[PDB]
PDB file of C-alpha atoms in Angstrom:
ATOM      1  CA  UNK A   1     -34.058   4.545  -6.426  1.00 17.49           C
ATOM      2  CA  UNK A   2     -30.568   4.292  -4.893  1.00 19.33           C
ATOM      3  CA  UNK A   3     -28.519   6.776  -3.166  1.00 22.84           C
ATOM      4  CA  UNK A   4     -28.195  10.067  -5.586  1.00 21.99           C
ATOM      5  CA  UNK A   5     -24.386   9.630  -4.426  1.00 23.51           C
ATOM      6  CA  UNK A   6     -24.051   6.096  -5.807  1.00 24.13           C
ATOM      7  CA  UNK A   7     -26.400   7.158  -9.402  1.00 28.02           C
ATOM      8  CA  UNK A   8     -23.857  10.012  -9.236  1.00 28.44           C
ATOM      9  CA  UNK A   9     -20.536   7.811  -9.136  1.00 24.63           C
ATOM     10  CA  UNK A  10     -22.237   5.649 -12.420  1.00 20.42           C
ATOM     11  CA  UNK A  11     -22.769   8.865 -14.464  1.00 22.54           C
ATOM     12  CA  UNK A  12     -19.024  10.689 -13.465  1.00 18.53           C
ATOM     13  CA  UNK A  13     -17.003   7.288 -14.224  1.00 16.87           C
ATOM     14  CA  UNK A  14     -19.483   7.468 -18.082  1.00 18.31           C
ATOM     15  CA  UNK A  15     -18.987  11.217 -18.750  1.00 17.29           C
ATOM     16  CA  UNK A  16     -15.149  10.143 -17.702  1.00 17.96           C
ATOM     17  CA  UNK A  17     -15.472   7.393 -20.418  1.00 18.46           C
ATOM     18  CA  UNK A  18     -16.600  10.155 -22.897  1.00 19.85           C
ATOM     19  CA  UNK A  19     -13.820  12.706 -21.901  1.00 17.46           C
ATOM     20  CA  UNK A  20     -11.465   9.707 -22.780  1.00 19.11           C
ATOM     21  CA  UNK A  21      -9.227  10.320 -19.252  1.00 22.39           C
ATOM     22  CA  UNK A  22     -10.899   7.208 -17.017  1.00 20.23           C
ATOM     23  CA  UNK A  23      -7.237   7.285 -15.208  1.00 22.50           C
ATOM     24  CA  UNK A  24      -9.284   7.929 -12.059  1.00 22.23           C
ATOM     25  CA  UNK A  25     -12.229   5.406 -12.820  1.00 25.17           C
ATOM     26  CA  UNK A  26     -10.932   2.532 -10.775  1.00 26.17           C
ATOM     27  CA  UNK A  27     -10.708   4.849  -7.593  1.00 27.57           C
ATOM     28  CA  UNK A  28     -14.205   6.024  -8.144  1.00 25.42           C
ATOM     29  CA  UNK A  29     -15.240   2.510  -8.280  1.00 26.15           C
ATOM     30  CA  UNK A  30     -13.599   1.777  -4.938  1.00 24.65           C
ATOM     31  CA  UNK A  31     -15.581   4.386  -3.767  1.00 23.50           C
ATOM     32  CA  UNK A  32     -18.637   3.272  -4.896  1.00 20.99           C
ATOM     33  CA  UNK A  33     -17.825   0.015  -3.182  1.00 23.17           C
ATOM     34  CA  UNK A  34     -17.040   1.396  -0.218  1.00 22.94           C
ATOM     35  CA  UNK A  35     -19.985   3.273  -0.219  1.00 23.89           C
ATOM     36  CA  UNK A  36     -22.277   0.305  -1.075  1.00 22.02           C
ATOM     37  CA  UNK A  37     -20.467  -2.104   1.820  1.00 23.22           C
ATOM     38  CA  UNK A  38     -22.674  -2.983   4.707  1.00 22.62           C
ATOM     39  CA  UNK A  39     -20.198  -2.654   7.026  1.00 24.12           C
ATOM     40  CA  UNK A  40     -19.239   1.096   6.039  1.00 22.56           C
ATOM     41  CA  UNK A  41     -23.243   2.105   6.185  1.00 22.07           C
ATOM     42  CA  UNK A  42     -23.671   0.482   9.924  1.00 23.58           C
ATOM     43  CA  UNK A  43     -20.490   2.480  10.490  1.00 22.28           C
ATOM     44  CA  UNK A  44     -21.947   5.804   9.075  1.00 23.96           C
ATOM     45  CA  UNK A  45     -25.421   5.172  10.422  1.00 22.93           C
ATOM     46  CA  UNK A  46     -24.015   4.767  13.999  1.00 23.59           C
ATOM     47  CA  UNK A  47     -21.961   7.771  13.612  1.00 24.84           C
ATOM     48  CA  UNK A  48     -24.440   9.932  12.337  1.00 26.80           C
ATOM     49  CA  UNK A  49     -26.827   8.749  14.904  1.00 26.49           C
ATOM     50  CA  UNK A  50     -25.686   8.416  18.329  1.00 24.77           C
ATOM     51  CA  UNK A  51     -23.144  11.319  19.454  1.00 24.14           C
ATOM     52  CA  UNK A  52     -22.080  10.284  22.738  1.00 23.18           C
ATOM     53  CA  UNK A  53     -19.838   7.245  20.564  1.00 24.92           C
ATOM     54  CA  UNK A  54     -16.552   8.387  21.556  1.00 29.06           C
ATOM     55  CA  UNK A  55     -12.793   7.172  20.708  1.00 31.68           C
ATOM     56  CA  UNK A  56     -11.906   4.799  18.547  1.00 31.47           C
ATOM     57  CA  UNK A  57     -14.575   2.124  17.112  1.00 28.80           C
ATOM     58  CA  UNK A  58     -12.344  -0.137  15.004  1.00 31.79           C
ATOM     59  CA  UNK A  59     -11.454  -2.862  18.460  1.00 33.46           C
ATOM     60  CA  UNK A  60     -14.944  -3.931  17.665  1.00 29.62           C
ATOM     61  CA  UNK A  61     -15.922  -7.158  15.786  1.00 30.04           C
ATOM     62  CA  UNK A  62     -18.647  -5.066  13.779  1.00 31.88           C
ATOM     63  CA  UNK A  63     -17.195  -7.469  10.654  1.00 34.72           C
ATOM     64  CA  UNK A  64     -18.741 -10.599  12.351  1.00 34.56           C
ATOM     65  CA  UNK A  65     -22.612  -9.203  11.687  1.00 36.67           C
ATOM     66  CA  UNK A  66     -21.378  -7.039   8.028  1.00 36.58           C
ATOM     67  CA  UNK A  67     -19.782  -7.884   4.927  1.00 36.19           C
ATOM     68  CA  UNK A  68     -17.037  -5.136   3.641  1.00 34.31           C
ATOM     69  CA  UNK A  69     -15.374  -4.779   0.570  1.00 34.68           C
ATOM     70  CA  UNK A  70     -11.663  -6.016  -0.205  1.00 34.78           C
ATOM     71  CA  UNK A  71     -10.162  -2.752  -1.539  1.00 32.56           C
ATOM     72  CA  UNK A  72      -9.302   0.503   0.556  1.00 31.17           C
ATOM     73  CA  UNK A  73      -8.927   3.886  -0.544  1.00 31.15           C
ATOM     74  CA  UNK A  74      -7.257   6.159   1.554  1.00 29.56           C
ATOM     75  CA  UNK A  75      -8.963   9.949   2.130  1.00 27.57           C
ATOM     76  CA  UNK A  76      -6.153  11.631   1.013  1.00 29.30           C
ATOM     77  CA  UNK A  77      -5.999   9.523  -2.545  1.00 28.57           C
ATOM     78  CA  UNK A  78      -9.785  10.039  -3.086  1.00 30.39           C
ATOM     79  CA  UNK A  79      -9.747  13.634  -2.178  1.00 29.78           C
ATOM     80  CA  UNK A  80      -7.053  14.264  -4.853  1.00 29.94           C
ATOM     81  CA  UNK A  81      -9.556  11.916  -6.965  1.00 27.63           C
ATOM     82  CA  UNK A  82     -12.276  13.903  -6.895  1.00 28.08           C
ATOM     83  CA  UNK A  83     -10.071  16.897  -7.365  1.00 29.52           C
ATOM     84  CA  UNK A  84      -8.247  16.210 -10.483  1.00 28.77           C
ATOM     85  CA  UNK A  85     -12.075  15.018 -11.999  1.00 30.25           C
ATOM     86  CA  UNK A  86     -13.030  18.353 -11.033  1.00 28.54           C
ATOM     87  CA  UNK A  87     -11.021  19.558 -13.370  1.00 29.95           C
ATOM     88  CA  UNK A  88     -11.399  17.420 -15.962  1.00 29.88           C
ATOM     89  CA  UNK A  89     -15.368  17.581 -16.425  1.00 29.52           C
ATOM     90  CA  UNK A  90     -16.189  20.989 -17.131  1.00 32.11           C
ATOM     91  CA  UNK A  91     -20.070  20.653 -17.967  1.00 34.50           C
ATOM     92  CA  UNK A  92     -23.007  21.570 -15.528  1.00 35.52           C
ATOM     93  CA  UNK A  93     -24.158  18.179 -13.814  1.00 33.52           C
ATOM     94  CA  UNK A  94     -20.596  17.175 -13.674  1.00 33.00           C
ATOM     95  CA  UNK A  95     -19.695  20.270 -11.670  1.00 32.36           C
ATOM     96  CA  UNK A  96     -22.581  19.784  -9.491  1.00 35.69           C
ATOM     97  CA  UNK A  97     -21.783  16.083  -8.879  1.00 32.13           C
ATOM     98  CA  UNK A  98     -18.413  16.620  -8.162  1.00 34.13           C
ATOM     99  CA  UNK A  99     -19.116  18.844  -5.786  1.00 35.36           C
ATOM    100  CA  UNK A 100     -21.966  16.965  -4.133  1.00 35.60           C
ATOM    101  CA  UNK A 101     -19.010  14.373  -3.554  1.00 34.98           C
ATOM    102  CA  UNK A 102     -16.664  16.805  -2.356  1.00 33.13           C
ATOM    103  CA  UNK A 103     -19.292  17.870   0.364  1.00 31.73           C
ATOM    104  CA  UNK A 104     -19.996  14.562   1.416  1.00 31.87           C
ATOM    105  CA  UNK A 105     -15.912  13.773   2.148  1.00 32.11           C
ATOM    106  CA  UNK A 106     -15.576  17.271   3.761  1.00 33.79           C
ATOM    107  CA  UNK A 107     -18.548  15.802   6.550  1.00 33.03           C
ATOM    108  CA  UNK A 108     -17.122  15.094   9.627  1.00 30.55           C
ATOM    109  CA  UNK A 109     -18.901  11.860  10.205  1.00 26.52           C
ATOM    110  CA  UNK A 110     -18.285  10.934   6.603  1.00 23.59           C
ATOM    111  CA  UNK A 111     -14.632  11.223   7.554  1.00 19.36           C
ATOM    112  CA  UNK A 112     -14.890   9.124  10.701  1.00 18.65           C
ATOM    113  CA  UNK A 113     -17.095   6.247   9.636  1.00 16.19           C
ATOM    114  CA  UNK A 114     -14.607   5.914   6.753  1.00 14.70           C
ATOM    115  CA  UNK A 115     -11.789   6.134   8.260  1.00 13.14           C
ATOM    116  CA  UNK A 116     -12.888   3.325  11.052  1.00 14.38           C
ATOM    117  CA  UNK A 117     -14.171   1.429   8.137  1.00 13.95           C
ATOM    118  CA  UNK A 118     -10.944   1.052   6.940  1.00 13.80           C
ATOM    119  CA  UNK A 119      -9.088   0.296  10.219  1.00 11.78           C
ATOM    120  CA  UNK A 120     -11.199  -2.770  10.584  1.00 11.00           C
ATOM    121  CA  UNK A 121     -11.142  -3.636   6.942  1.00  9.88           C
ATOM    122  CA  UNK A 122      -7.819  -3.720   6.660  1.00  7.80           C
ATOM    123  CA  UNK A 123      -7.551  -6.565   9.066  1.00  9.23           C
ATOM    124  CA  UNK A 124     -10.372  -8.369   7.188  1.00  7.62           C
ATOM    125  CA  UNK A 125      -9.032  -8.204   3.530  1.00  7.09           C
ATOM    126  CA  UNK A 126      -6.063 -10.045   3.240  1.00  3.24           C
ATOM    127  CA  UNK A 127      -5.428 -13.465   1.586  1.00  9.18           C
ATOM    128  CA  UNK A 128      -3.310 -16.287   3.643  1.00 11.40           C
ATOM    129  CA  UNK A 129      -0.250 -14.907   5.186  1.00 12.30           C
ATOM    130  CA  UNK A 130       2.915 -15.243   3.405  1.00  8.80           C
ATOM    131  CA  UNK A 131       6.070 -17.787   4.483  1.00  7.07           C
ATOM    132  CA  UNK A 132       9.292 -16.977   3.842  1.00  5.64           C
ATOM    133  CA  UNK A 133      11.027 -18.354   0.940  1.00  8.10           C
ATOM    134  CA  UNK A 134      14.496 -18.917   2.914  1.00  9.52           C
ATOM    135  CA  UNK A 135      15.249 -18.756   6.363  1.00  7.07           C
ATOM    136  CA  UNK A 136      18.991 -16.970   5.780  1.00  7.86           C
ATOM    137  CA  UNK A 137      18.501 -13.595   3.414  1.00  7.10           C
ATOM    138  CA  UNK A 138      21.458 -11.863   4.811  1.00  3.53           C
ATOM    139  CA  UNK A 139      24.117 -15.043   3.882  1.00  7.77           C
ATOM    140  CA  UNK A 140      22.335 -15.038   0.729  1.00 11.49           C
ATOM    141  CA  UNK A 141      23.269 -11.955  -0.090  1.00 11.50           C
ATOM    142  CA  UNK A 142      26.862 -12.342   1.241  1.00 12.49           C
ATOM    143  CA  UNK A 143      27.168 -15.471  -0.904  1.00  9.46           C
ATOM    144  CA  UNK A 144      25.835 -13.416  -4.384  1.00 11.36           C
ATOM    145  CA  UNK A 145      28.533 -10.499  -3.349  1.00 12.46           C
ATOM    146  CA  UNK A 146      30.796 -13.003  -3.172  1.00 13.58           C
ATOM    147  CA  UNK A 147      30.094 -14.489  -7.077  1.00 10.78           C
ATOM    148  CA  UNK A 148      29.794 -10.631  -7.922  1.00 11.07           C
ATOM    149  CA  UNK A 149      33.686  -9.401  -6.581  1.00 15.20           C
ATOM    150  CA  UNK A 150      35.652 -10.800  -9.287  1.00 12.12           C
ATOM    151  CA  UNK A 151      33.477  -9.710 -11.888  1.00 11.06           C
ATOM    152  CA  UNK A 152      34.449  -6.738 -12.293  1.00  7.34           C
ATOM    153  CA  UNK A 153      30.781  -5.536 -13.832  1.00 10.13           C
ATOM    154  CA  UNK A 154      30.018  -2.351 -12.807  1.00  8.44           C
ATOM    155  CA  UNK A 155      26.253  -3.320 -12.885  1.00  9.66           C
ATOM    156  CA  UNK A 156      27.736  -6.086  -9.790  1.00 11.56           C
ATOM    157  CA  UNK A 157      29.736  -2.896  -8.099  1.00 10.97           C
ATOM    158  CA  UNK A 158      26.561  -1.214  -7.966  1.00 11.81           C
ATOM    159  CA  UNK A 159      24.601  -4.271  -6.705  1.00 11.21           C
ATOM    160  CA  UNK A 160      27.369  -4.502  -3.661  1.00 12.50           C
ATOM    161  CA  UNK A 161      27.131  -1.157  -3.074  1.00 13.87           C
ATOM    162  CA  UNK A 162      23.420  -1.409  -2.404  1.00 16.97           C
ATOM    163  CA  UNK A 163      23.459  -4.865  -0.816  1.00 14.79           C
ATOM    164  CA  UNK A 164      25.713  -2.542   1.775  1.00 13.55           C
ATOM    165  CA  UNK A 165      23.463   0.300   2.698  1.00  9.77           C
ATOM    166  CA  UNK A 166      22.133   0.311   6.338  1.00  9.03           C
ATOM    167  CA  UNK A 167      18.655   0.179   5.469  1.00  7.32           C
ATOM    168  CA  UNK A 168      18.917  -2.763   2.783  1.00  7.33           C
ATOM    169  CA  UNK A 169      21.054  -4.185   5.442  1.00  4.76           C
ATOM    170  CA  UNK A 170      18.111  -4.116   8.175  1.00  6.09           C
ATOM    171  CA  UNK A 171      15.972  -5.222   5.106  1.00  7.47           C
ATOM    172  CA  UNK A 172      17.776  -8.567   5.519  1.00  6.57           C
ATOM    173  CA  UNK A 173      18.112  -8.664   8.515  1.00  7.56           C
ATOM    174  CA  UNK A 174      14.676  -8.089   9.426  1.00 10.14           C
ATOM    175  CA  UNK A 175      13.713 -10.675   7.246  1.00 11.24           C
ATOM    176  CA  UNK A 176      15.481 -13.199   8.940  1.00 14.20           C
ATOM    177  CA  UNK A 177      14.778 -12.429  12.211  1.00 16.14           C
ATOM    178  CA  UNK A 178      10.904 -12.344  11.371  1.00 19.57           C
ATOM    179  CA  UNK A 179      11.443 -15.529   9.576  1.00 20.15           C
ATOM    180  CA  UNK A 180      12.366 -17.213  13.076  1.00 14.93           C
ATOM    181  CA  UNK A 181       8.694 -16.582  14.386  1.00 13.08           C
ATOM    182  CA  UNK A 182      10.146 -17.354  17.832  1.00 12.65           C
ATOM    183  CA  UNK A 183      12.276 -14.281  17.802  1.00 13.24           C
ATOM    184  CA  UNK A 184       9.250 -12.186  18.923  1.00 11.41           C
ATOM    185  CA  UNK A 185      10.424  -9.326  16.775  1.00 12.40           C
ATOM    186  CA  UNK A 186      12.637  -8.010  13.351  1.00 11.45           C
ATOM    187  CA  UNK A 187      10.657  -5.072  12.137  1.00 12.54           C
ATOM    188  CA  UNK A 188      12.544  -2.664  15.094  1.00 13.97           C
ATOM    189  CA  UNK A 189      15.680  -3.071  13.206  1.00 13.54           C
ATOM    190  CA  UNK A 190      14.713  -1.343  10.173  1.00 13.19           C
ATOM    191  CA  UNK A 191      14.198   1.859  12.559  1.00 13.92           C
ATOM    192  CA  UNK A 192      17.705   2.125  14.185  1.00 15.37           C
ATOM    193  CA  UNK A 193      20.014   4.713  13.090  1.00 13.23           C
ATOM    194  CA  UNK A 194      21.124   4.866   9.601  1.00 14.19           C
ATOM    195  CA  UNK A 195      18.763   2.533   8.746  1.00 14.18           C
ATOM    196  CA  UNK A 196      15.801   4.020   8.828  1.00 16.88           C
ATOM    197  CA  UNK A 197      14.869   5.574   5.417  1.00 16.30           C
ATOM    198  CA  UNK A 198      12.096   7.071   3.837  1.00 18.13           C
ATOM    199  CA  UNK A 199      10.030   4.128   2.500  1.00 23.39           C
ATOM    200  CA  UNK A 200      10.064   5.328  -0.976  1.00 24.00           C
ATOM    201  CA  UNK A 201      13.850   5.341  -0.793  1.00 26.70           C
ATOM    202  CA  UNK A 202      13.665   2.121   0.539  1.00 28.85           C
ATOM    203  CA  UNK A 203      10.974   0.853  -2.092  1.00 29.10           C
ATOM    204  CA  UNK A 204      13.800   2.503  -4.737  1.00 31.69           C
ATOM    205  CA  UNK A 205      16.855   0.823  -3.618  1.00 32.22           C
ATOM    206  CA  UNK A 206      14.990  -2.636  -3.522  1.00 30.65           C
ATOM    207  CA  UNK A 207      13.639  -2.207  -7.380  1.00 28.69           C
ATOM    208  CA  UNK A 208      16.728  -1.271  -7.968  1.00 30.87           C
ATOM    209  CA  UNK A 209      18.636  -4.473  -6.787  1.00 29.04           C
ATOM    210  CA  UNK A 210      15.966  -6.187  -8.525  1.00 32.96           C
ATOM    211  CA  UNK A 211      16.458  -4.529 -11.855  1.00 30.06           C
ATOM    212  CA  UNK A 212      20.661  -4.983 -11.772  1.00 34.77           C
ATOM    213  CA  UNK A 213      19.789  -8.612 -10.546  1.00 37.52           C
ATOM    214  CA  UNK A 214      17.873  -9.485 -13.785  1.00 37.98           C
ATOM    215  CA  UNK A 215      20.270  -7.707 -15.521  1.00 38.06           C
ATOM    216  CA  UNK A 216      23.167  -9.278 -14.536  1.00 35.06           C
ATOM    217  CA  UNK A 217      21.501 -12.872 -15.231  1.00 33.61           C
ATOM    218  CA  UNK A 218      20.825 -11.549 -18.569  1.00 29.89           C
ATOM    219  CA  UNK A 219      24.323 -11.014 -19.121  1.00 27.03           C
ATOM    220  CA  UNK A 220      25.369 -14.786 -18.662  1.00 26.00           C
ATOM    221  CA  UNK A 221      28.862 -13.870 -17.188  1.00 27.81           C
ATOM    222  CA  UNK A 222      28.272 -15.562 -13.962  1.00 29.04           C
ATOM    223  CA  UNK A 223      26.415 -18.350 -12.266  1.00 29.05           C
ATOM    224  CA  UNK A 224      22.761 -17.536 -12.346  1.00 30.35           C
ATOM    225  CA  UNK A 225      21.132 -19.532  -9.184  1.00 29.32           C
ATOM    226  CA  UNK A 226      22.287 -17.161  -6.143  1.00 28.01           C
ATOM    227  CA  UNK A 227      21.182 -13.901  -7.967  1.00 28.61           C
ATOM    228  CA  UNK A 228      18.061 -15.440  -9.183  1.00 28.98           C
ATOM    229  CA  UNK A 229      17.342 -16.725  -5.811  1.00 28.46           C
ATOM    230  CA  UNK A 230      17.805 -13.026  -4.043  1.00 28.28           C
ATOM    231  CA  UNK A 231      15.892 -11.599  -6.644  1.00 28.52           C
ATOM    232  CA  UNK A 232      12.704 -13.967  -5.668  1.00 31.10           C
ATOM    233  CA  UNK A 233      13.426 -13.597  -1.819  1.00 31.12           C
ATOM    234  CA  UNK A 234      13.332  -9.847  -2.313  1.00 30.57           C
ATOM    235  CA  UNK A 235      10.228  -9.515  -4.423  1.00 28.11           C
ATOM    236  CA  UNK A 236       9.190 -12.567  -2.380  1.00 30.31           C
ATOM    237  CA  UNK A 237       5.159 -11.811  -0.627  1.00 29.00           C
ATOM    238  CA  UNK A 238       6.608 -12.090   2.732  1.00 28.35           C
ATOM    239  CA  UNK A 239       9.552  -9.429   1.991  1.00 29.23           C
ATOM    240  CA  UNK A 240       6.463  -7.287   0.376  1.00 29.93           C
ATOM    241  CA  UNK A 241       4.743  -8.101   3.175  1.00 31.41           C
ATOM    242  CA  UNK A 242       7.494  -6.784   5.860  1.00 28.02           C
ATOM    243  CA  UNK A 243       7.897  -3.283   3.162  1.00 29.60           C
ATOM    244  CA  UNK A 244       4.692  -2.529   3.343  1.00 26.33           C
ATOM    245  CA  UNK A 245       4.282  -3.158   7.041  1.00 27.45           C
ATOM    246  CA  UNK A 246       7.332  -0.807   7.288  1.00 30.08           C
ATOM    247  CA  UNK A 247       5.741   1.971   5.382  1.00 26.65           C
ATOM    248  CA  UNK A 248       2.850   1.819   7.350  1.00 25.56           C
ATOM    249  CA  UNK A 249       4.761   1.980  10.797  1.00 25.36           C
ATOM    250  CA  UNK A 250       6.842   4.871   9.117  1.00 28.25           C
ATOM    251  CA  UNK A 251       3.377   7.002   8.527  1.00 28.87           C
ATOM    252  CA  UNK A 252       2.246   6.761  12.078  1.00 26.80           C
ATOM    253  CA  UNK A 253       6.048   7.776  13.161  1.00 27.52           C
ATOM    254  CA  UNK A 254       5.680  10.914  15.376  1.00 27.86           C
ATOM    255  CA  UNK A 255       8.373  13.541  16.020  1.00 29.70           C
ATOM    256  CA  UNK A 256       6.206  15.264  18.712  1.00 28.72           C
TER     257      UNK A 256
END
């Protein structure tokens, strides 16, 4: 038979089914994956078994010799997983499962095979790197304030408003300076002064441009091609791409 851990994951996600929740089923089944991936049980295995392996493990290639999986799930997320199930399923085995999981993520090695597991996955999972979609995003959005000014929209006074905060600002500007590929750098700028921002902010204020974008193409009161254009280059992969990147950087910040 399998691992009980693995038999355990099939019968939560069912009794889930039966309680009619399942909001947490697709986590579990990244878990399960994880689990299952032969580069996360040489990980554990070696962990588990030979002590004096000290620091960090991720620098090595262990991905050339064993397959992983293509999602991640970060500790904290499947902690708070297994939490909320635990109280959701209030019957005997379900307990007793859930705790049986909770154990197993409290274990030290558990905690440090997965979370090297996921520093080289990470690296591994990705499709082909995005391009940008234009090399100039900061005179593209110059040019759509321009159309917007004599407007007089207040969906277009927002917009410009936003299109003028620091931090959408070094957005841009990062963007573009990525985009050059030759310029070494780009991400620095979104750290400098006022315009570094909490990435949710950030990820708020972008939607947002996005959302009075669409809108204001909707309303067929002005030319459609520059605002349709920003709207791509900021939902655009390699914008996602430098967001996410962001957020990450912006996790690992340390203030001593």
């Amino acid at each position: 038979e399998k691992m009980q851990v693995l038999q355990v994951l099939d019968r939560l996600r069912g009794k889930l089914q039966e309680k009619g929740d399942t909001t947490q089923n697709e986590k579990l089944s990244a878990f399960y994956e994880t689990l299952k991936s032969p580069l996360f049980n040489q990980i554990l295995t070696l962990q588990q078994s030979i002590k004096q392996l000290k620091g960090q493990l991720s620098h090595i290639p262990l991905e050339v010799l064993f397959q992983g999986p293509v999602k991640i799930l970060e500790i904290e997320d499947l902690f708070s997983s297994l939490k909320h199930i635990q109280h959701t399923l209030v019957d005997s085995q379900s307990q007793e499962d859930i705790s049986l999981l909770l154990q197993l993520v409290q274990n030290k090695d558990f905690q440090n095979a997965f979370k090297i597991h996921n520093a080289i996955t990470v690296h591994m999972n990705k499709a082909s790197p995005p391009f940008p979609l234009i090399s100039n995003a900061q005179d593209l959005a110059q040019e759509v304030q321009t159309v917007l000014k004599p407007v007089h929209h207040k969906e277009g006074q927002e917009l410009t408003a936003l299109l003028n905060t620091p931090h959408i600002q070094a957005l841009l500007l990062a963007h573009d300076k990525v985009a050059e590929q030759e310029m070494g750098g780009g991400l620095e700028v979104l750290f400098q002064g006022p315009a570094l921002v909490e990435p949710l902010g950030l990820e708020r204020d972008v939607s947002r441009a996005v959302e009075l974008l669409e809108r204001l193409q909707r309303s067929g009161e002005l030319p459609p091609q520059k605002l349709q254009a920003l709207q791509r280059v900021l939902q655009s992969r390699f914008c996602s791409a430098i967001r996410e990147v962001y957020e990450q950087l912006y996790d690992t910040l340390d203030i001593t």
